[PDB]
Amino acid sequence: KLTSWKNELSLQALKADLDAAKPSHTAMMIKVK
């Protein structure tokens, strides 16, 4: 627990957001390529 906040993000929630957001970015990068 790095902070004094009552509720903290934790690393796992952030990785969940990354995993959720990645599919759109992958489909987008095809056009740039």
Partner: protein
């Protein structure tokens, strides 16, 4: 088809056919208790169960080398699920037959 044999004396309760025989039906009528169970989650990361969806649209982006044809794309979904029963003394059930 988990009841008894259903002859012609049926007063009008639902039945079903199990390999050439007529058998009754059993119905749950369930009661969930408080804090009886919790659902195990693998990287669900919140409350909702987490799905995983993929899609590869038809195109040259998967032209490969064995077969440039086969434009058939796909979409796939998968998930992990499990349950833990902390106290099984708080789940109640009343089996019964049901009318037509």
């Amino acid at each position: 088809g988990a009841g008894a044999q259903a002859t012609g004396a049926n007063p009008g309760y639902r039945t079903s056919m199990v390999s050439g025989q007529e058998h009754y039906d059993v119905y749950p009528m369930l009661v969930v208790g408080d804090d009886s169970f919790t659902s195990i989650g693998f990287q669900t990361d919140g409350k909702s169960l987490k799905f995983t969806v993929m899609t590869k649209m038809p195109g040259k982006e998967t032209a490969d080398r064995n077969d440039p044809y086969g434009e058939t794309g796909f979409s796939s979904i998968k998930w992990y699920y499990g349950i833990l029963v902390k106290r099984p003394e708080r789940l109640a059930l009343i089996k019964t037959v049901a009318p037509l």
